[PDB]
Amino acid sequence: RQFGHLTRVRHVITYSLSPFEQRAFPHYFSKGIPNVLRRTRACILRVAPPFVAFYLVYTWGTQEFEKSKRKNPAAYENDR
């Protein structure tokens, strides 16, 4: 496991450019924000709904905890 003994690669050509010759942030807001959005659209459907379902169970459970904490109308009413 070293550079030279990794694997057999053939017929590939890699064109590169010096970091001083090229830019650091090439088309960052131009090409990026769309690419970021595309990536968000790809994942969102798989990622979000469980956290939404958590939020629903969270607020509901806290709501129902506050309901059960509070008074009830059958506590000695219509019973003097």
């Binding site: 690669v9 053939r10 050509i13 890699t14 064109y15 590169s16 450019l17 010096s18 010759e21």
Partner: protein
């Protein structure tokens, strides 16, 4: 058409040199050049005279990966001086 146009443009007298070396008399070479080479045209059509625009050197890499070949060949270089520069020495 391309070959003949390339010839007609670039192969001309002011862009050319006749060199010689050995046992020969400069006067005689000049007579031979006058007698045979003076038939070449001596300037342009007022355009078509290409002059060299300077070439941009770019620090960069090219890596033709090919494991089938027996020995790796590497060539690394920085930007050169040009023919004129005394630094060459």
């Amino acid at each position: 058409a391309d070959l003949t146009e390339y010839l007609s443009r670039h192969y001309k007298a002011p862009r050319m040199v006749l060199a010689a070396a050995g046992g020969l008399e400069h006067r005689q070479l000049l007579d031979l050049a006058q007698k045979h080479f003076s038939g070449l045209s001596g300037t342009y059509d007022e355009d078509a005279v290409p002059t060299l625009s300077p070439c941009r050197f770019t620090g960069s890499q090219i890596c033709h990966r090919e494991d089938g070949l027996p020995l790796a060949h590497v060539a690394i270089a920085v930007e050169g001086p040009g023919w004129a520069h005394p630094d060459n020495v």
